[PDB]
Symmetry: C5
Subunit: 269 residues, 5 copies
């Protein structure tokens, strides 16, 4: 994709060289100086934009970081507060593991059913799949587990509350991820910046050819590489739950989560 | 926007057909000064759009919190008082009323339909009497939580747990109000817009000396880049203004309503 | 201050002396190209951008702090209604302190006299207590804390519900510090010092380095460049005094009225 | 200004440039503006970022100090509100909190805490504090014992103990925040190399400037040198916000304010 | 031999090559002006500026994370004394776990062996149990959690006071999560890929563009412009791996020492 636009730029430079003979005749002059202005303007704009994209990526990485943290500490509190309640341990862990996988699926816009069935009773799978938000439902069921221990008097209102906070933290992760997935910043205004860099890159050799002659392709490819490299990297970072090269290894992240939670509950991968 | 590009092409054609008369009289326009001007304008547009983007992001975050806090509040009600479905349905009404009412507040549109749909007509009059209707809804949601505590169904601890979620909604209300009765750059936003507008119309006259017939092509391309970047900032600066795209706000209020009905088993339709 | 129209007009005068003294240039041997003024102009524009950023942030923080007053006081009034709906005497006392706090904080930041307002809202005993302090607004918080505190001794609030309302006072305490910190810590003077020199000197020497290129079109270009750098410099001017009384500053009286109106709407037996 | 030295030194180099411009072709030395435009702008961009990074450190340092005032204020309020009678505890706790500020200032300035410590506390304590290589942390632990004892005594519940405990946490965070900004500087490549670069650019600039400016060069080069060197030295100043320079923090004024605040009116309250 | 001085000396040679070969330009048909190399270099600087910005923030984040370790450990030991002044048995056990956590984290981020430092601090029954887990640092927190848990079950801590100390474990959990997130997820390798190529190629081709305008002045001006760009680029590289072993990286050994000495001073050791 990047190499296609680079090859088309080498070609366009040749078009500029072979048709430079016609330049004076057809009545067209093109200096470097105006293209330097527009060039720098674009660079400034790509610089800010690209930084904005990196921010989103870092936030996305961060939210997933919190899934692991919150889940670890929720399991920790369960063990420290109710060390004898290993039934509750196992079931809650099931939901927390389910939550992660379901979040991966949600963000990937794929089917959660395989993973859900692996981890949970089929009655719960139907309840979870029935909801507009399966991750929200999973949190509600994990909520019932601690909520029932509270009714049984095995948790106090304080110790229920400490565990409730972690579910609250997971709610916040889910909200943040949902926010980052459903936020393409006006669909037109990324396509409009892209068509700008593109149109600048292909008109540049035409302007460069006066000053450079046969060097035109070598300089024009180098400039275009730089600008396109930057533009496309910003594109990858913008959508961090995607399946692109420089996007979050969400399946690996989910494995780490499950393994951690299994390690904490005396069980073996 | 497309008017201003057509105005630019018109200004370019003027600059071609008049280049002869004026540059001979002793009035010249080089590219080097308009390059300094344009780069500085770009730098300023760069920083400007940065401030704009951050207002846009804060708006998204605040609205994200509505979703989050309302969800966790309804979770807490279900987990702490599994039996109290009448309380569940009342609190869910206000929470959904809160979202629509806040949207209507920011967009400066009429909430009446949404309130009449969600709430008892006594409550709707109380809410519509107030000069701060969104706050009033929050207060009502409060009483429901308060009555449950008074009835001994919530302890001070568990009342407290739900109370935090109402604070979170309060923070969202305020943050939004501050992002609405705005901006913080107090109508300089019209000066930079004109600074761009004038720079784009004087530019063909600076460029024609170097480009002759190519001028309308190169001048419109530059103008496009600057005017687009300026337009984007203006759009982002004002996430709740009467001209903004209302899709995501509506999408948000719909999401939460749907979520909440699901959470209280009002969905799906019974078999 | 609209010195922007003075300096724009001084710039026209600076172009005029440049056009007519342009002959006496090579005689002396003084030449001024655009190129090194592009380098300087760019460098000045970067530093102007980074500075205006700081200026902007400080203004936003001022808004946020004031925004929190409204939030924390709304919620503290709410809490009192839902937790103690019978206790309208306590409601009215706490409310009057909260309103007092807002007004007192405004007067403090504006360096004006809070006495009139305090006396409108509070008992002369309390006014005396507040004004006796070297930190009046902080003392109002202490008094508001005392009402909440009494309710706790009386047993109308548990340690838990006491705690829920204390946090709101902690928030108003962060507003108070915030505002104080802002009022005493400007964007460092050096910035606005350095930049005010370089931006003015630049706008002055510019028509001199443009006339060689522009002959007669020097006023209309040097002005348009100058207006651009000065607009952007004066934007920082109009954003660095958020607590003032100027048109561009925060409408703190209006905000205080908004606060008072809000807390009165929340009370009235309904 | 160490700038006034290097600004005059720039004028001397810019005379050398005016006299040498004939001999350029003799010595074989062509030197256009455009390469130094590229290098200058690159340096401006890097100065902009560096300076922004420094201001951040300034701002964070200021904020952490702000929290000291806030947290200490509310912790006194909490004691005045929850235990209104316990003045001996109030007085003891306040003296530790005041010790905390001065102690921290001395820690960050690397000066002797003993003067200010003796002014405020019992001599047994002044030696317990001085015996620890972490004096500020020690003071905190001491303030911690005071609220702890009030709880062993059953004068505070677990809840009301917690409310105060949180405020000591907040101060621990300031301590850590301040230690991080102090013991961790902005890495020495950032300062050492960037200063070489700005100055080496500043000396060479007139040599490439003559061709265009002829006689005007010493002015237009000093103006450029001012702009660049000002920005770099200001960055260098703000990087170390607990230092003693002009644009650094008034740490002495701040601890005076903290003290005046806690001790307001012989420490008497309504 | 120091990467930076080598790439400078390659650039002084690139300049003499450009001087000696300037004659052949006219004949071979290769015209190279400064104007487009200004556009290129400026763009590269902007992108270098923004990139360096990201690398700095990552370094700063790592610093804050370690700052929190010290803060949270200090206040947890402080709480232990103020709430349970008699229970020095528990003080010593918890302090040893808290010091273990610091060292374990250090070793984890350094990909080095925690055994020596852990054996120095803890009983053998514990050290093997901890090292048996694939998440040893997380395991140490679960064990510190247990101490707090036992003290609660023994009635020595109330639910409230248990809560107060539990939040301090939560804080350490976040540090661990944050640190792991920084160690495993780098600043996207595309940033180094793109910018290392583009800077190097730009510095190399530059004298060939400068030579027409600068002649024998070329080497001096070219090495200077190279130095400015290469220094900035390598500074970003040194800031990007803050858990490394360089002198420019975080003195993690010093910090862990400060932590240990700190918590021993607090208990009377
Ligand atoms: C309400 C009380 C706590 C106030 C009292 N004047 C003290 O002292
Ligand atoms: Cl956590
Ligand atoms: Cl387990
Ligand atoms: Cl929440
Ligand atoms: Cl229901
Ligand atoms: Cl609140
Ligand atoms: Cl239900
Ligand atoms: Cl009332
Ligand atoms: Cl506080
Ligand atoms: Cl009322
Ligand atoms: Cl802490
Ligand atoms: Cl001990
Ligand atoms: Cl001890
Ligand atoms: Na906790
Ligand atoms: Zn022609
Ligand atoms: Zn957490
Ligand atoms: Zn178990
Ligand atoms: Zn929340
Ligand atoms: Zn229900
Ligand atoms: Zn022409
Ligand atoms: Zn549904
Ligand atoms: Zn709040
Ligand atoms: Zn009332
Ligand atoms: Zn003002
Ligand atoms: Zn606080
Ligand atoms: Zn007292
Ligand atoms: Zn000369
Ligand atoms: Zn903490
Ligand atoms: Zn001990
Ligand atoms: Zn023993
Ligand atoms: Zn080993």
């Amino acid at each position: 994709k990047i190499i296609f636009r680079l090859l088309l730029n080498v070609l366009m430079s040749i078009i500029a060289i072979i048709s430079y003979q016609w330049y004076e005749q057809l009545g067209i002059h093109l200096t470097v100086a105006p293209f330097s202005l527009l060039g720098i303007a674009i660079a400034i704009f790509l610089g800010f934009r690209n930084s904005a994209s990196y921010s989103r990526f870092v936030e996305a990485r961060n939210l997933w970081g919190t899934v692991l943290i919150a889940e670890r500490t929720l399991v920790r509190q369960l063990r420290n507060i109710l060390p004898a309640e290993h039934d509750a341990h196992r079931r809650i862990v099931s939901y927390l593991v389910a939550f992660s996988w379901s979040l991966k699926h949600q963000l990937r816009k794929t089917d959660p059913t395989a993973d859900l069935r692996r981890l949970l009773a089929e009655e719960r799978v139907t309840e979870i799949l029935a909801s507009s938000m399966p991750t929200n439902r999973i949190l509600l069921l994990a909520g019932n587990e601690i909520g029932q221990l509270r009714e049984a008097g095995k948790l106090s209102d304080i110790t229920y509350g400490l565990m409730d906070n972690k579910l609250d933290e997971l709610a916040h992760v889910l909200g943040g991820c949902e926010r980052l997935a459903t936020t393409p910043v006006p669909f037109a205004y990324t396509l409009i910046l892209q068509r700008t860099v593109y149109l600048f890159c292909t008109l540049l050799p035409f302007a460069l050819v006066g000053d450079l002659h046969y060097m035109t392709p070598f300089v024009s490819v180098f400039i275009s590489y730089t600008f396109l490299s930057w533009d496309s990297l910003a594109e990858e970072l913008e959508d961090p739950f995607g399946t692109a090269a420089n996007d979050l290894p969400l399946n690996a992240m989910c494995n780490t989560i499950e393994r951690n939670l299994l390690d904490m509950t005396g069980q073996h991968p």
